[PDB]
Specification:
It is classed as oxidoreductase/inhibitor. Keywords: inhibitor, oxidoreductase, OXIDOREDUCTASE-Inhibitor complex. It forms a tetrameric assembly. The entry is titled "Lactate Dehydrogenase in complex with inhibitor (R)-5-((2-chlorophenyl)thio)-6'-((4-fluorophenyl)amino)-4-hydroxy-2-(thiophen-3-yl)-2,3-dihydro-[2,2'-bipyridin]-6(1H)-one". Four copies of one chain form a homotetramer. Chain A has helices spanning 3-7, 29-40, 54-65, 105-126, 139-150, 163-177, 210-213, 227-244, 249-264, 309-326, and strands at residues 8-10, 21-25, 46-50, 75-78, 90-93, 131-134, 157-159, 184-185, 188-189, 197-198, 204-205, 208-209, 268-275, 287-295, 298-303. By secondary structure, chain A is α/β, with parallel strands linked by helices. The first copy, chain A, has two domains: 14-161, 3-Layer(aba) Sandwich (Rossmann fold), CATH 3.40.50; 162-329, L-2-Hydroxyisocaproate Dehydrogenase, Chain A, domain 2 (Alpha-Beta Complex), CATH 3.90.110. Chain A has a six-stranded parallel β-sheet with strand order 4-3-2-5-6-7, with helices on both faces. In chain A, β3, α3 (54-65) and β4 (75-78) form a beta-alpha-beta unit. The longest helix of chain A is centred in the middle third of the chain and has 22 residues, at 105-126. Chains A and B meet through α1, α2, α3, α6 and α8 of A and α1, α2, α3, α6 and α8 of B. Bound molecules: nicotinamide-adenine-dinucleotide (NAD) (4 copies) and the ligand O=C1N[C@](c2ccsc2)(c2cccc(Nc3ccc(F)cc3)n2)CC(O)=C1Sc1ccccc1Cl (4 copies). One copy of the ligand O=C1N[C@](c2ccsc2)(c2cccc(Nc3ccc(F)cc3)n2)CC(O)=C1Sc1ccccc1Cl binds at residues 131-132, 158-159, 162, 187-188, 227-228, 231-232, 234-235, 240-241 of chain D. The site of one ligand D0V has 16 residues of chain A, from α6 and α8.
């Protein structure tokens, strides 16, 4: 006998499977911040980590495991092989190529496409009914790439999209008004990053439209330059990268918030990247951010935001650009 | 009139002095993991970050601020100047430097000579929580420079060591670490002491059931559970270059007991002079009761002669280094 | 030596003031539901309970204390004497007279006014710097009564007001749209209860105005009868009382949410009752619900909602009625 | 087109089975306290309530639903019919009414409840709170036909929680850091295991050998005595107990729902242990997870402690053998 048998009498031996498993692919700064935030919010009964760098992967797994006493996630696993990811409810993709100096933006997109050609079939093999959450950049293109390779219905392929853009916007809006971001409502939609769209019409506090109160809101004529609040969202992203070399905490927190709605079937509305073909005159197979209802089936529904002619044209332009890149990709 | 003035009527612009403020000094992997864990546990109404690297500091502050929508800590500030730390209830020190060993210690002492008087100036009634290594020596250094009473100078000590021990114990027994009780005391790190007599599940002593527990003659080699705590630390550093998540989580747990005055018992480094035949001004880990005044009380653990001797040896080593330090 | 002295070495026995204390006055179904919700949200380091019924008070205190192992509030106290309430940051008043009319020659208002005449000076004595949160009905009159007796600045006297009304509205709105109440924005303002005002203009999902999409929203002409959502808020209150005899859980949860913003200085916007003199043509010392910014100083700011002529008239009517009762009250 | 259709575009109408459903049977003070505690801890994606009193049941359901904005449980349902309980992972029984008479009345209540629960949730874990809890866990196990791992009794979980509260008050330490186990028969006949009583792994019995004896100058035996006295005191003062039991049950629910494998003092089938040969349920430290009780801790009991559990087993079996199923 052993001390374990001497101490514990076993009733059943039945080895069970997890009921609420989450996988994070890529254990970089983004991946690990998603992981800690998911662990601290008790969203999973099992967490799996996958990467190609075997040393960093094992080390990251061990560090999280060493914090088990302070967590409510009883099993943390990791591996190069996707068998560790079997029957995940949600799979978060944060894996990506490093831009290699003098490398064209198109070449970098194709290198991420080649990374996805290995990841996505492996994820689908072990978790065919999972929801895919894409973080890796350019997020709108890579959500399309994930959807194309997986063969999943559009509801199960979610792009992080304008979730962080909107979170940064609400932070800045909150600083200007001296109100908590939670009570400062405003939506940044369309293409994630530089080409995103601030929807001035929906910007409000307690249902009081800021555009109705201040008609110059979002225009160049605006004496208070509220257009700078969206400009600062883009500038802040470059500033964080210049100051600390990457972004981790804000993206990790935003992803755990999406994960919460999916895992708990909350049916909360989030600005995430979805297949927008058929909206705003877009005819191409492109993914853009709109407010989506997130639950156990991923994106079950989307909010049909009324956009101005200028806003509609900006999303249309982004669709044309993304399709222009996408049509040239080698699968 | 501005849009803000048209939208909002102001009752009063009076701003209160910080109420549940926490400061983290050093924004390396350890400090930032402490920060995210404290933020996700809603322990503070204000978080301040300090470092000497101004770019990294501002970037770290901004990244946390950008996550405000998903948090319940309304004010996140940072700066090189300690005015940002004013009125903190708890100040966490994670700042750190073939070296001469006494040299490594003296480099961190020189860092503490700048940090500690600045912390004391802006938060004279704060509790100090030391993480920086060698943690037992630097808790002593912080206590000496600050002039604070012993209850307000807490060392992270064997909190991480015990958390790793309970994780490994839990894996061996197929039981959650929370239900696996065991204490690792004395000197943090390599020289720590596993108290085999207190290792239990549901109040059932593992040493009573298995007398060879903790000895070399144990066929099940339970001594390896403590050996793996030390080996795992070297393994994590070899694999990823540093430790962050586990230390971060353990520190936020200490912060919870202090901020909420819980009076829970934690293995932390305290002034041990007068215990286990120790006569020197050294800090070692024992189970301490943590609350709003820091360490108000300590548990008097009955140690075997071998355990007492190991703590005595650690005390002699630590004092040997300490007596040679320039302040 | 005692077992305690053999086991524990004491460093100091310095009695320290509680840092985040909350008091609940009145341990009826409302007070106890506020108490459990505050305890389960870790908002306080000390909870005090006050009532006139000494048996029920002690029993309630003991029951909560017996749950200490599962909580993070280390000290729960109770008493008839207000010394137990000393140094509270927030004091919640849920005390009210027996509804059975025949017990007194005085009305419910008169009865609850005389109760406050004894409670409020005692609360002020032991916690002069506290924030007062009034739940007791008629909540708008008794918030005025608390403000008048206490002598506190308007920012430190908060009425529960239309917080429950708006929470029920968002629940019903959510059921109609198949969206979580969190993502369904809508404000019920003015006088708490039967005479409350649904602000149709601010009703939205993702910043998309429901009134802009559906101009008949809130009118009698509306084929979908959205006006019934507000009617059901009032009907549901009577239905809960008819079915179980009182309301507890929903009010308790709503109060703990207000307590969270105050205790954590969140500066979130809530529909609560505040001194409305200087707004909507109101010149009297009356308290009505408007969206208020809640933090460590209580109500530091209020949102100036643009109301329709009909909406403005309804608040004005409530103000005239409230003042009519109030002017006749003897202090 | 309707406002809903103008506002929202639907991708799919596929409505899955609930993944983390909990049912509470009986909406008295105990059941409702279990409900609020479970809702505030985010343990379920769906909560179902069942009772025989239709008005109180609907009212309780509505009150909880009105708090949805502040919760993370998107669906709260209720009904007299057990179809509302379909596909529950955990079913909590708090329903209830001479001793053998009172037991039989509760057995007759269980004869209706248990087959209905089993019909709609055959793979659920049963958590019994209703008194006498040890007898009614046996009744539930017998009627359901479930394996012993899926029939859990609240047992000495509350007794232990009260013990740790009182131990914490004596020592000036948080109950979490005060370890001590109350086992055997729930209530009046419970057993305090003095050998396991400790703070930071320091045995109180080793420091103070008189601990738990009549000879004890400090009368530590009174801490256990006060656990039983406090239960009568709460009932005398407010008429029932709700908050402490609700919080203790939500803690058990957390370990089961999240498969934590934490050790709890709960009622399990103890035939084969401590010389007990009868089909009786008593509290011992059990490992709780997604399959209910997968394992139990083999606590070393003294001859006196063993005899107390044996006496409880004889009494419980004496009542059980006389029950009409
Ligand atoms: N959508 C957003 O809002 C947002 C915000 C910030 C960052 N990002 C993006 O997230 C991505 C990652 O960011 P990062 O800072 O963590 O980068 P990183 O380079 O530090 O981490 C990427 C990880 O992916 C791994 N990886 C590479 N190939 C792999 C493969 N075939 N299989 C498994 N893992 C593989 C790498 O080894 C590495 O660990 C980037 O594409 C970045 O642009 C997106
Ligand atoms: N006690 C434990 O259990 C435990 C566990 C792990 C790590 N550690 C210790 O924590 C410390 C930090 O670890 P790390 O990985 O984050 O190291 P790090 O070097 O990456 O970070 C240290 C930070 O301190 C800053 N710093 C240096 N001098 C400063 C000054 N005068 N003022 C303010 N900031 C200053 C640095 O700029 C740096 O950002 C180390 O000493 C390490 O050994 C302790
Ligand atoms: N604002 C809202 O949205 C809202 C919602 C629901 C209920 N309410 C109100 O909350 C109040 C209480 O509701 P309830 O169901 O708990 O009533 P309750 O009668 O059951 O409880 C009231 C308690 O107040 C106590 N009390 C009476 N006089 C006291 C005094 N001088 N000092 C201390 N305590 C005293 C009573 O003894 C009793 O315990 C009512 O006024 C009710 O209308 C308000
Ligand atoms: N195990 C413990 O530690 C512990 C602690 C406290 C209370 N209890 C027990 O919990 C039980 C309930 O306590 P209470 O205070 O809530 O009693 P209660 O009478 O107020 O509530 C019981 C509920 O069960 C309902 N019920 C009766 N028959 C039913 C049936 N056939 N189907 C569905 N529901 C039915 C009743 O209508 C009632 O609402 C009691 O048996 C009590 O002794 C156990
Ligand atoms: O916060 C970030 N930082 C990143 C970054 C960069 C290196 S590590 C993290 C960032 C910052 C700035 C630009 C930029 N451009 C980019 C373009 C194509 C790619 F394939 C990858 C990155 N990316 C990645 C990213 O998407 C973001 S959000 C962001 C970016 C630009 C404008 C607005 C927002 Cl809200
Ligand atoms: O997990 C760690 N990692 C560290 C680390 C983190 C970044 S670089 C090194 C570690 C790991 C291994 C050895 C070691 N030794 C050391 C000695 C003196 C010093 F001043 C600093 C470090 N330190 C720092 C540290 O204290 C720990 S806990 C730890 C260490 C050794 C044995 C047991 C434990 Cl529980
Ligand atoms: O949910 C409730 N129930 C109460 C109640 C009643 C008895 S115990 C609790 C309720 C329900 C219905 C009417 C009503 N009227 C009332 C008027 C003056 C008073 F001083 C006290 C009560 N009160 C108390 C109360 O304020 C509410 S909210 C409410 C009430 C009516 C319409 C809309 C809402 Cl959101
Ligand atoms: O806190 C309670 N109160 C109850 C109660 C009473 C009315 S409503 C709830 C209690 C309190 C006191 C005695 C008692 N006896 C009893 C015996 C057999 C039964 F079938 C039912 C009740 N029950 C039910 C109960 O089990 C408890 S815990 C408890 C009880 C007695 C001693 C120690 C503990 Cl830790």
């Amino acid at each position: 006998a052993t001390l374990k048998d001497q101490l514990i009498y076993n009733l059943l031996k039945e080895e069970q499977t997890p009921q609420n498993k989450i996988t994070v692919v890529g254990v970089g700064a983004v991946g690990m911040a998603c992981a800690i935030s998911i662990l601290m919010k008790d969203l999973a009964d099992e967490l799996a980590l996958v990467d190609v760098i075997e040393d960093k992967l094992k080390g990251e797994m061990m560090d999280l495991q060493h914090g088990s006493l302070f967590l409510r996630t009883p099993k943390i696993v990791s591996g190069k092989d996707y068998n560790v990811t079997a029957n995940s409810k949600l799979v978060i993709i944060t894996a990506g190529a490093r831009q290699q100096e003098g490398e064209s933006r198109l070449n970098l997109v194709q290198r991420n496409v080649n990374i996805f050609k290995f990841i996505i079939p492996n994820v689908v093999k072990y978790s065919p009914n999972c929801k895919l959450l894409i973080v890796s950049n350019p997020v709108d293109i890579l959500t399309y790439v994930a959807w194309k390779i997986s063969g999943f219905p559009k509801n199960r392929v979610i792009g992080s999209g304008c979730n962080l853009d909107s979170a940064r916007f609400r932070y800045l809006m909150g600083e200007r008004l001296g109100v908590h971001p939670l009570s400062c409502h405003g939506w940044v939609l369309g293409e994630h990053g530089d080409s995103s769209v601030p929807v001035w019409s929906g910007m409000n506090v307690a249902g009081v439209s800021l555009k109705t109160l201040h008609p110059d809101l979002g225009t160049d004529k605006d004496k208070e330059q509220w257009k700078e609040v969206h400009k600062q969202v883009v500038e802040s992203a470059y500033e964080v990268i210049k100051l600390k070399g990457y972004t981790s905490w804000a993206i990790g927190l935003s992803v755990a918030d999406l994960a919460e709605s999916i895992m708990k079937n909350l049916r909360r509305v989030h600005p995430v990247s979805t297949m927008i073909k058929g909206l705003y005159g877009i005819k191409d197979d492109v993914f853009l951010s709109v407010p989506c209802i997130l639950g156990q089936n991923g994106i079950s529904d989307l909010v049909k935001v009324t956009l101005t002619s200028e806003e509609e044209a900006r999303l249309k332009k982004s669709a044309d650009t993304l399709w222009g890149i996408q049509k040239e990709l080698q699968f």
